[PDB]
Amino acid sequence: HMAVIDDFEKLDIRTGTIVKAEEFPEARVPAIKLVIDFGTEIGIKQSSAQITKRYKPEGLINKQVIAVVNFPPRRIAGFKSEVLVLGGIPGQGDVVLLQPDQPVPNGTKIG
Amino acid sequence: HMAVIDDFEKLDIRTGTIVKAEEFPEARVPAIKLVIDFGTEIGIKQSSAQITKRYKPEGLINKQVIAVVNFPPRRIAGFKSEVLVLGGIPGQGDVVLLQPDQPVPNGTKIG
């Protein structure tokens, strides 16, 4: 139950901008396919995000989001999800996205 | 270097509301003491945050923040800092706080 700072330092947590978002009707659990620009050191990354409760694709473009970018990928229905986009989880199937409280460059590190 | 999801699962990342904010510097760097309500289970925690570049105490009260709650405490700026408040780091001495993009209850878990 207790972590150390070393646990946290293993993670590469970064800001990126949603540049594409589409409904993902092939996922078992409702999801949106995201493409996110993490700047040129990290690259442009795909994510499958179970965020259909509060969000629509037309509302996601140009949002700054927060993701762990140094995990192995997960394939769902053939789509390669490359990053874990972080959010608060107020209840089952519910997500509230995290964001920097003001704009920062893509690839800005979190600590 | 790469991480695995359970490096992430070791962390307990929670939302909380800043209920008090005071200037509490170190000798060599300014800093703010945050008193944060993480809801009824976690309770009230304190944090030393080097966030004075963009923020004043008056602009911090009532803000929902994101923090790692299950680290060992550390002594800093004359008190026990119990929680790591997360922000983007755009440059030397600069911090942009993370927030939920919409209000969530205190103690909402991040995933």
Curated annotation (Swiss-Prot), chains A, B:
Keyword Zinc-finger listed: no
Main function: Can suppress growth and secretion defects in E.coli secA and secB mutants. Probably a molecular chaperone for exported proteins or may act by stabilizing the SecA protein.
Protein name: Probable chaperone CsaA
Induction comment from the UniProt entry of this chain: Present in exponentially growing cells (at protein level).
Subunit structure: Homodimer. Probably binds SecA and prePhoB. Probably interacts with proSdpC.
Any one GO biological process: protein transport
The gene coding this protein: csaA
Residues annotated as domain tRNA-binding: 7-111
Protein's UniProt keywords contain Chaperone: yes
Species this protein is from: Bacillus subtilis (strain 168)
